[PDB]
Every structure is written in C-alpha cells, then in structure tokens.
Amino acid sequence: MIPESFKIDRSVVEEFLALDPDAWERLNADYTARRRIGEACRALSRHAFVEEDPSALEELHDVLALIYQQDFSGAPVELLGCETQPVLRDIAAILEGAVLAAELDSISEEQISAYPRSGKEYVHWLKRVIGEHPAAGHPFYRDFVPTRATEGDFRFYLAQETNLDPKFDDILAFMQIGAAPDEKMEIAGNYWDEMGNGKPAEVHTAMFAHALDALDVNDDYIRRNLLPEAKASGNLASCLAISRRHYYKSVGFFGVTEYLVPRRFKLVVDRWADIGLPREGIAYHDAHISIDAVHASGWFKNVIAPAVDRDPRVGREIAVGALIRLNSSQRYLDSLLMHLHHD
Amino acid sequence: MIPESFKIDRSVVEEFLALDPDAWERLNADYTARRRIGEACRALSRHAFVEEDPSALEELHDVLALIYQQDFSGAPVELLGCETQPVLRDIAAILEGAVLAAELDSISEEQISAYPRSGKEYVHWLKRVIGEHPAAGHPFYRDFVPTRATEGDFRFYLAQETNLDPKFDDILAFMQIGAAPDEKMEIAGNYWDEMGNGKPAEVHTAMFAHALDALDVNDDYIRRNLLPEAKASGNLASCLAISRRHYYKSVGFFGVTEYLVPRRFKLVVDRWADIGLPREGIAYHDAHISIDAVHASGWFKNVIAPAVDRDPRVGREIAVGALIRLNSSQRYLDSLLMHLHHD
Ligand SMILES: [Fe+2]
Ligand SMILES: [Fe+2]
Ligand SMILES: [Fe+2]
Ligand SMILES: [Fe+2]
C-alpha cells in the first residue's frame, strides 16, 4: 500500500476513503504502512504547529475535518463494509493531540487552578473568568455588526458558522453518553429542544439551513470561503465531543457557547432587521436569544455545578474547555473581522 | 512495552487502562508493539471462532466488553489525559470483525435479498421474516416464565439483561448521529421517552435499577452469573451502535428489540405479579408493555420505511441486523433456559 515514507494531506485521506472493503482490510493488517501514516501525521503536525506554516495548518484541519465528517455523517451505502477505524482513529489521535497541545500552550496553570471547589461558587468564578476574556465582548458583534455589516458580510459570516451550529444536536448527543444523572437530564432536554421538541419545523439545523438559503450560503461558497480558524473551531468542537475523556472540557467549551449566544445573536438579529434581510434568518437567531438564556442557566446549574460538586478536580478540565472555546473564538473573530475589513 | 509475541486477554487490557498518559503516548508511537497487539487479537479470534474454544470466546467478549465500557461510561478523572483510541480501536476492530463474521456465517443470501424495494411493503416483509424466527416466540417467555419461573430464576434472568437495557438511551443517542430527518426525529423521541420525558423518576435506566434492587441483582452477582451469550448479546448491541457504518444493521437490530418487547414483558410481568414479587419490577416492565407498542410502530413507520424508500439497498443491511438480533437472542435464550432447567 504505502511502500515509502510519504506526505499526508486531505487528498491522501480521500484516496483511503475510496478503498474497497478488502483494500481496507489489507491496509489494516499492514502495520508498516500504518507506521508510515503515523509518521507522516507527526510531520504534518510539526509543520503546522512548530514551524507554524499556514498551509500545513489548514491542511491538518482539512484532514481532521474529513475524518470528523465520517464520524458525524450518515454513512453512505458504498462505505458500509469498510473498516476505517484503525487508520482514521490513529490519524485523528495524532493531529488532535497537536491541535490540543497548541491550545494548552495559551492556557497557564494560574488561570485554571484557583477555582472554588464547590459547584455554585465555581459557577460565579467561571462567569467572572469568561467576562475577563475579550471574546466575551468581541468588536465583531459589538461594533462591526450594528454599524457596518451588509448582506455580503452576513453571508461570509454565516459560511464560517457552518463549522458548528449544523451539528449542535449530535454534539450534545455525543456529550451525554455515560453522563451522571443530573448532567445527562440537562443535556438531554437541551438536545430535545434542538430537535424542536418533536416538531420538524422547529428543528434547529433545519431553521439554520433556511438562514443559509436566505443569503445563498451554498456548499461551494462555504468551501471557497471557510477560514482556517473556522475549520479549527469546528474541529475543536468535534474533537471534544466524540471522546469520553474530553467530556469535562466539552462541558466548558459548550457552556461558554450557550452563555454567549444571546448577546451575540441579539446584535445580529437587530442589524439583520435594520437592513431588511429575509425573515428566515430572523427565525433561527430569534429562537436562540430567548432559548439560550434558559440553556445557559440550566447548563451552569445542572451540568457544571453538579460535576464540580461530585468531583471538584473536574473544575480544572471545565475551565480548560472554556478557555479553549474563548481563545479559539477570539482567533476566529479576529480573522473574520480582518477579512471583512479588507472588503 | 511489548518485546515479544504475547497472548491478549482481559487482564492485558486492564494493564493498558492502568498506564499513565506518557506511557500511552509511548505505546501509541510504537507500531511494533501495536502490530503484536493486533496479531495477538487475530490469534484470540481464531481460537474463539475457528476452533470455537469456549474459553477463548468468553475471553474475547470480556475484552470487547471492557473496551465498550470505556466507550459508554463517563470517563474517570484519572484517565482524562490517556489517549486510548489508537490501541483500543484496533483491538475492537479486529475482535468485532470476527464477531460479525461469525454472525453472518448463519445468515444466507436468500434470507436478505428478496425484500420488496419500498418502505411500507418492506415493513410487512420484515415482520413476516421476524415471525418465522423461533426467537420471536421463544419458550423461555412462552412456556418457562408463566409456568415455572421463581424469584431466583428472575434474578438470574435480570442479571443477563444488564447486557442491554441499562444503556438503551445511549445506544439510541449513538444511532441517531447523522441520521436523515424522519429517522432522526423518531429516534430522538424514543430517546426522550427513555429519558422519562424530562422526569427523573421516569428515566428508564433508573426504573431498571429498581427492578435489579428488588431481587438483589448486585454487581458481584452479575459478574459471577453473566452468561457468555449475554456478553455477546451486549457486545453486539454496542458494536452496531458506535460505528456510523453499522447504522442500518442497528436499525434492524433494535427494531426487532422494540417489536418483541411487549409480548415478552407481558409474560414476565404477569408471572412476577402471580408469585408476589415487589412492585418496582412491575413498574419497569409495565411501562414498556404499552410504550414499546408505540415505539415499534414508530420505528417501522418512521425509521425503517423511510430508509428503504430513500435507498432500498439498505433493506439488506436492516435485514442482516434483524437476523443478528434474532440469532443472538435465540442463543442467549437457549443458553439461559438450559442453565435455568439444570437448577
Ligand atoms: Fe440551537
Ligand atoms: Fe442552546
Ligand atoms: Fe426503555
Ligand atoms: Fe422503547
């Protein structure tokens, strides 16, 4: 299969996904080919995060995005017999470990150690910590959107947001696997809300797609305009949700998400109305402004506080996940605003 | 780490799960140790399914059960930094492939090819096919339970059923990842029912635990009395749920489950009452007798029929998953009844 040391990129992984079931079985039996895949991933990781080559960084997130696509998407009939896990999980573990190591390089021990070791108190501490971060009040939402954002700006912004919102329901489904009762209940009700409480017209992914349609945020536009930090943001969300061991990070990552949505979406929706854009986008953001004040409150009170009270050691992991969401959001919004300013 | 060809068993995998994060990283970097793990798994698989050694078969399912435990359980604080996926996913892929190959050895092409290629028609065909299988009317439920079953019999039976019911909610959560809209909606509502529609007292795992408590089906009793086919049954459910590519098999596997629960549980509940057992076990089984007539109807009409109508090629996979549930159930119930007769 792989008779030499090679370079790995998205096209290489696409070739893998075109293999037939017997070819996959032969690849899985060849630990020499698999060692070469792993060594190639470690080389890509060095280029991306040690050398910080922007081309390698985007290539690494393109690779991870392709794998998470397999983890999150309904499998196609042609791929049903293909055992992709031995190779794809090795690639993902290597590139994920590099992505997470780089996030942690921006997180100091002093930020994640002085938390109160009980639940209600921890929530006050975390909200304060979130409020210290600039991503909690980023000028893209506070200044650019109310004063300048055009339809073309919103189209480009929505293209970036496809990294996350279209898979919120399955992120929650992954997160709640094996969760303790109080935490599981709260995540379950959040998921049921994402599922429109049983009404197909109120399913959040369906409503989000209508906002995309309203501005012709089509698949090809998305592919051409997705920023590297949008890809990283989407890959972080997937990485944390699909491993049990990242659950507490995930609790902080999506806790920040729920907490911040109402103020951000209120600014988007007011400007959207001000410039006469269609009502479909009003619908998706309108829902969340009210819904996510309740989701955020429930998340702090019924996921974060019980987990800390059960084992306060997890307060460190939750704070790490919160800071990862904030840092990655900041890089995403700064990159977004920089690109929007240029136009 | 592994300086020689070795034999793999549950204790070996427990040693892995005791490694620290650095030890895991060193193991993951050593594709020679990893080749030896894979070769050891292929040897265990041959002993279990070619030679059909009963000791090796139980060892293989003990190993898979330990891995799925990691996939399904809230991760412990001590394991949060350990990258278990490269080794554990290779072990699971090898042993799973052997488990599934053995199931398929009992399924002929003529059983899974003559289905009608439209949804409503496919449902009539599948119900007929299910009714031809002896597991659909097994004498454990039809004859032994109404006429003979004692409290000790129910205690032993419930110990076997811990392979499945205590993780139904997360099986559904795994299954619905990436599912098309109609199928996703139905699975989502089923999951919400498992979650007591938001009421903690009506959560199904909680109600199941009370039935276990009613007969002191404690963890140590379960460990000592779990039959090899109970382990295989539980591992099949996990295997099919956690891989996207097994979704359509999973649709048939748990479709059979919902379809068959009301007749089986009605017999259990009537005998339970007849011999004066506590009301807690009445509660869990009482719920499902009515609930699962609705779940089965919804599953056929809103999961199975839409999937066949979208792509009738999936009718073959659904029929395979149905037959895997029926065949594995038969082996489980025959083994159960044989053991109960001996006492
Ligand atoms: Fe939402
Ligand atoms: Fe929400
Ligand atoms: Fe249930
Ligand atoms: Fe059910």
UniProtKB/TrEMBL annotation, chains A, B:
Tell me the Pfam families matching this sequence: Haem_oxygenas_2 (PF14518)
Domain of life the protein comes from: Bacteria
Per UniProt, which keywords does this protein have? Oxidoreductase
Q: Which GO terms describe its molecular function?
A: oxidoreductase activity
Protein's recorded name? HrmI
Q: Which organism is it from?
A: Streptomyces griseoflavus
